[PDB]
Each structure stands twice: as C-alpha cells, then as structure tokens.
C-alpha cells in the first residue's frame, strides 16, 4: 500500500484536500412547503452529494487498494452515516438548526412536517450540540468520517486486515492531533473514546433513517433517484 507509509500530518492533509464541497439545495423561501417537497429537496440534495462522496471515498487512504466489490459494499453500508455526520458537522455553529445546505436551514417544527422524522431530527441536533461542546476540530472530523467509511461495513463481508491496518493508522493520527493540541495522555484517551462513541449513535441514526427512507419509497409519493434506490436496496 501507500497509506501505511503515510505520516500523521500527511494523512490529515490528504483527507482535508479530499473534502467534498458543500452543495446547494433548490429551496425557495417564497415557495410553499408541501413537506413532501421538503423530502424532495433533501432527496435531490443527497443524490448529488453521493456523487461527490464516491469520488471522495477514492481519495481516502487505503480505500483504492480494496477490490471493487468491497468498495461497493463499504459505501452501501455507510453512505447515510457519512451524509449524516457531514450534516451534523455543518450544523455545528447553528444551535437548534440543521444546515442541509447554505440556503436550507431547518429546525424542529419542520422535521415533524414528515411522518416520524422529528426524533431523528432531535438526535442529529443532539449530536451537533455534542460536537459543539467538545469543540470538534476539522482535522478530527475528516478522520472520523474516513473511519466510518472503513469500519461500518467491515464485519458484513483476507484483505480485511488491510482495513484494520489503516484503521489503526487513523487512530494514530487522531492521537497525534490531540497531543498536538496540548492534551495530556489521559485527556487524549478520553477524547478519543468520546469521539468513537459518537459513531455508535451515528450508526443508530443511520439505521433509523434507513427505515424512514424505505417507508417513503413504499408510499411512492416522494420519488427516490436511481442511485438512491440501489443504495437503499443494499440494506434491504
């Protein structure tokens, strides 16, 4: 590989350079709000984000070294998780609101506009408030996002040890950042643990969200894109 030979700072740089752009919504503040069009906006948004995510994934250290079949599996498993932690990161400095896009900020009383979505909304807000209190750094964020990509589907498939090797490399990087920030050895371990426990909740939110999206498809009122449909079928 070439990812194993990467130093901690090289890892951070490569990850920061690979960051996808913040895409815009089609939200028109003057236009009505069907709340089936809200999901329409979000569906359109996510579908475009997926295209950037896929190309982002190919720049994540170690990911390219994997077979194409395994690359497919990891993205199928983690795409909503990655979309969600991205959403949470963008919304960090907007308390009580979710920044789906620079032109699309939503709060609690717009989440209930869709059936059984307000709880997922509150979970995302809680995660965002958590990142805020922790003062999550951008360097730490890109590490977490890459970890989700590699980890979330690693026990659903050899070359899985290569993933564990890269996963350990990202752990080294995370610690490197914390020691750099002047945190004591005890503080590094604690913060590292705190960050990784978040991933459990992001997993939970993804599972809940994945169920809501399946329900929306069966209703067939908000049409999912061809890519989004295939990603959804992957979880069955």
């Amino acid at each position: 590989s070439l990812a194993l030979s990467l130093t901690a700072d090289q890892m951070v740089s490569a990850l920061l350079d690979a960051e996808p752009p913040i895409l815009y919504s089609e939200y028109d503040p003057t236009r009505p709000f069907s709340e089936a069009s809200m999901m329409g906006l979000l569906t359109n948004l996510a579908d475009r984000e997926l295209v950037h995510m896929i190309n982002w994934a190919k720049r994540v250290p170690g990911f390219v070294d994997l077979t194409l079949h395994d690359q497919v599996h990891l993205l199928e498993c983690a795409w909503l998780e990655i979309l969600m932690i991205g959403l949470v990161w963008r919304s960090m400095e907007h308390p009580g609101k979710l920044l789906f896009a620079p032109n699309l900020l939503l709060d609690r009383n717009q989440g209930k506009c869709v059936e059984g979505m307000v709880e997922i909304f509150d979970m995302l807000l809680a995660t965002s408030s958590r990142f805020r209190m922790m003062n999550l750094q951008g360097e730490e964020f890109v590490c977490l996002k890459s970890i989700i990509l590699l980890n979330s589907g690693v026990y659903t498939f050899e070359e899985k040890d290569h993933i564990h090797r890269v996963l350990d490399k990202i752990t080294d990087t995370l610690i490197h950042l914390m020691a750099k920030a002047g945190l004591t050895l005890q503080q590094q371990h604690q913060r590292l643990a705190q960050l990784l426990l978040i991933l459990s909740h992001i997993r939970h939110m993804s599972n809940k969200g994945m169920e809501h999206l399946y329900s929306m498809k069966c209703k067939n009122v908000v049409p999912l894109s061809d890519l989004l449909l295939e990603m959804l079928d992957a979880h069955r």
Binding site: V51, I54, N55, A57, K58, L68, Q71, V72, L75, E76, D226, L227, E230, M231
Partner: peptide, 10 residues
C-alpha cells in the same frame, strides 16, 4: 449497478 459504475470510472 450505478455505484459499481462510478467507482470503476477511470
């Protein structure tokens, strides 16, 4: 498969 396609594109 779309995900297969985009990942594979050189």
């Amino acid at each position: 498969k779309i995900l297969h396609r985009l990942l594979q594109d050189s």
